[PDB]
């Protein structure tokens, strides 16, 4: 059933953020939510043109101490903050900025050693169904952006360590899983044959129909 | 017989002496937008007979070596009478269509065409990564053609027929509303497409709702007949056309 | 103990979570409730209230209050345009800071009709008819009254009733538009033109002002809570 | 607190688990549902749809489209073989990339009957009878029409009805076969022979093509979800 | 609904306290409860003149080992005490003083690695509703304090490590979240336009009505 | 959260325990059962069957 086929958590993104680093941007993640960067999930969703579902999101966060000459330290357990910033909200420029107050945006505070964080999001499109493809433009002129990317404005996910500055750097990796539930799908399409080349475009390199055999009667293996 | 068929919309009537059936969308007959499915609040225009009538596009030649053609809608009808005029003056539009593909030969000719309507027929570029312009896929009622060889011209779409410009298997296009014109039995194909989109109405210039593809799966062949090419003509009628958001006409 | 198994999400702090938690002040006796006037239950109650729109928010503004005054004058060329504005209630400078725009800026989606009320503030002796129209999106905005009159409009006549309401309907392909509006989510334009002209008897001022109010209708709603771009800080206050 | 005791499995992340978890966007108002045509509920609905089988997937293929055309010609030697294929819908190159084969490749087990539809694409003036057969597994495939006719078969006559359906029944010792088929799980062969011959009147082409479609029957099902061997990557895309 | 708009936990305060330091005051936090120091929550509450609600309080406490030349140590898990001192109660002068006995004041003892501490407080005002603004004085004379600060006497929150003296210093940061529930609001006001300058006063710097555009007819972007 | 308190035995792995645990293959469709002859339900059914006793298990 489509509910069953799509209803398993799949990794849709992963990135690293350090506990301490000279580069401000290496200390937090800023991800523009989408389902086009991880090949497996993408191919499945793309078997349908339109989809409507609620979404279960699970996060798997792991930390490792960076290698170095002096590693002796005794760091207490780490706590992470995952904040969702709907389109247009203030975006954090550094781990310690005001935006992390989340007076209105939804955030999750999670501590290592515990069950992975999780929550449900309802069907949030401004349309009646999510579009996996969009054969059109952003401008009425028939110019601007072309393709599904023009309809992607789900916002961002921002994640940082709470007050985790450690003497020697620790690198955390966050993995985000999506599991659609209460699903409906319309107008099915042929599965993607060519390998994916870009995250935000259908772009591909011609690939042959299938593999070949010596003649039209060959039926043996050797 | 049932082979006999007559269709009347507005001031035009179509007749066929040798047809198959009439394929209807996904079993869905065209219909006006209901109050419980609308967002745009202004009172719409429903020109009726002035727009919902049959328009015949320029004809084309099916030759022994032809490979296939496509037309994108509503673009293909942008110059057709009041239908085109209404498209220009309105921000939003909505319509279904009766598509009638005509092709007569003789009892001694052979050949077979697939007539399909592909919703959201988003296409790939001739060279991956290279953007192309609208002109590479639609321009009034001009028929675009597929090719056997893979396309090299970066200003074009990847026209290699076996992947139908979409990266899928051409023999699987049958999951979309379609009919076959097998010269041996048919002489035309009629498909009624309802409005299919993820939003209730949409801009008619900026979005090609569906693409009509006519593909020879079995090549045109004949013996010592004086006739050479076999013409293919497409006649289409908008159904339940309604428009919202009137303002100045779009220049093109 | 009862056998249990922790699932993902365990121990996390989700800002929008909704759980119970122990009370630090057990048995605290709350001060009795009192019936204060003006209770609000939904932010839409606020968005449904008129606020003055700074329609004349032009570049050369010397005096801030001028932004609320739409100029209208005698002997205006026939069919002249009074003003033109683009419908992006949460994004365009004309609306973004009104009551309606401020509420919209705490959300990412919006849907519904709007009321634009115009009030003539000249003397009781002045007269005039104006054509106020709404043009659903399309490649080009109306440049002439002839262009404008093809869309949704009302012809306003000045008399005892000083105000007129142009109600811009929800005409959209999608059920909701984005507050951070884009081309796909385009809403159109609202323009005003002289239908006849502002005529005046002897001994009255030569020009007058028109004001514009805006509020949401009963079919209006917002979705997707988000932080507003209108407030920030570099340091803790104090 | 209520006395509890954690059991094995506690804190693990099983990919196919099915638990509840907190919602990060409390009270988010979902966009209303819309009735889009073509809803799919089970992948078997797709596998039940015909797709063109590349039966003529021979070595010397110059033109890709030739793979879909089975050659048939005049004056063929009596009892000649038209084609032969082995029934491994998920493994053999003839089927693996069809709609049915692609769906099968996301599973490890399969069971049920199949429809192989053949459509004659020559002129209305050509005639012919073909014997299409299915041979349950055994040590040796049929090498002659005489061998083939002992198994399940149908004799196809060309006329107004251009297509013919050979329905290959589920004949197996086990309830299910493996998608990654092996000898134990062998399914047999499907072969086609000239019953009479393709006869033609004057002035018609000398050879013609036959096409083959494949789909599942109503007794068909798949089991054991698995990843497909048909897609991969060495790097993140971008 | 106002219940929904105000009903999300928002950070209203944060401060650090060390496990070991020469300065007595660096080892515990003393906070005069109020909702005026964190800008986001403040702006929301201030959209109404009077408010009446119960309050859910959640604490997020994280610890980090201070950087230094010698960091090797093996410190057991830390436990914190959060005590609420109603106006007039004895205030602690150091981490080890008698006041921490809490025979009557409410306290929470919490250990790191666990779910964040939380509890509910009922509507505790001496008035019928909390006042976000107060256009008046403390003295009948029309002198003394001016403004809402004169009505703020909710008490303090005091927090310390329980017996956490470590060989090398560890710094804990406490973040306190407020989530009003069972809310009622009266007489709505225009949202704050000018940025906030002081925690205990309305004080501001004149800010223009809105941003400008070239002329009254400009409707394009470029 | 609901106040709870872990008792001794918590987190241990007792070989003869009898608890539920998550299924790694959610919704896996099991092969249908078949009625094979000779089903055994209790090991005593086996012990109730005669077997030849090596009574003359002598040294030489």
Curated annotation (Swiss-Prot), chain B:
Q: Which locations, inside or outside the cell, does it occupy?
A: Virion; Host cytoplasm
- Superkingdom as given in the UniProt entry: Viruses
What does the subunit comment say?
Answer: Interacts with capsid protein VP1 and capsid protein VP3 in the mature capsid.
Functional summary from the UniProt entry: Forms an icosahedral capsid of pseudo T=3 symmetry with capsid proteins VP2 and VP3. The capsid is 300 Angstroms in diameter, composed of 60 copies of each capsid protein and enclosing the viral positive strand RNA genome.
Q: What is this protein called?
A: Capsid protein VP2
Source organism of this protein record = Coxsackievirus A9 (strain Griggs)
The organism's lineage is: Viruses, Riboviria, Orthornavirae, Pisuviricota, Pisoniviricetes
